[PDB]
Design a protein around this ligand. Structure first.
Ligand code: SF4
Length: 224
């Protein structure tokens, strides 16, 4: 599917069927998007929403989080699992207070330098909260791209990962980047699922190679 048709059909879908009312989409800031991205890395949206609300009520700004005791942060995280995320969350808050005056940094390199934030989470923060022109590549996005363009191979191998990032870059637009990047997460979460994807509900079904061959189970590849 040509890249301009990909982006236009995903944006047209999002306008009518996308999720726009999550709490970290209302009156968005870099801090709210970073906190939600870290909570969502390994947890389902319905479980995260009450934790996100409790964290924003107790820590309205990144400086408030930075100045709190780590034990208090770990107490409020209880139930989300994967506590290395919480330890790195507190460290990143401290890095923003210490190096950046309490204001979230707006360049790719400074965001990626934060503990617990890698290439995709950094692109997510800057595209979704400020409209900067970066693509993402979490597991939801990787599954949609690997099926639509038939990318076999384990994404654990560097050359396959590199191919998926080039494909993401190619289809991600500048105009509407915040809508597009959220829509790709929505598609992978709710429609292009690991098992038995709902292709009839997908705006890529007219150009997707996996749908044409009923071969979604091949993409992405599994570890050998
Ligand atoms: S048409 Fe089906 S396999 Fe292809 S991207 Fe959409 S849900 Fe995934």
């Amino acid at each position: 599917m040509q890249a301009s048709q990909f982006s236009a059909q995903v944006l047209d879908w999002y306008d009518k069927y996308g999720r726009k009312t999550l709490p970290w989409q209302i009156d968005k800031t870099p801090y709210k998007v970073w906190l939600s991205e870290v909570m969502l890395q390994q947890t389902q949206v319905a479980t995260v929403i009450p934790y996100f609300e409790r964290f924003m009520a107790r820590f309205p700004t990144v400086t408030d989080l930075a100045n709190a005791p780590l034990d208090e942060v770990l107490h409020l995280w209880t139930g989300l699992g994967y506590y290395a995320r919480a330890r790195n969350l507190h460290k990143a808050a401290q890095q923003v207070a210490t190096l950046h005056g309490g204001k979230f940094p707006e360049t790719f390199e400074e965001v990626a330098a934060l503990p617990g934030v890698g290439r995709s989470t950094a692109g997510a923060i800057l595209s979704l909260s400020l409209g900067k022109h970066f693509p993402i590549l979490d597991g939801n996005v990787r599954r949609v791209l690997a099926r639509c363009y038939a990318v076999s191979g384990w994404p654990g191998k560097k050359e396959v990962e590199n191919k998926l990032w080039s494909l993401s870059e190619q289809v991600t637009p500048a105009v509407g980047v915040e809508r597009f990047n959220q829509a790709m997460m929505d598609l992978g979460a709710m429609i292009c699922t690991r098992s038995k994807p709902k292709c009839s509900l997908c705006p890529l079904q007219n150009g997707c190679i996996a749908a044409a061959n009923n071969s979604w189970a091949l993409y992405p590849g599994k570890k050998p």
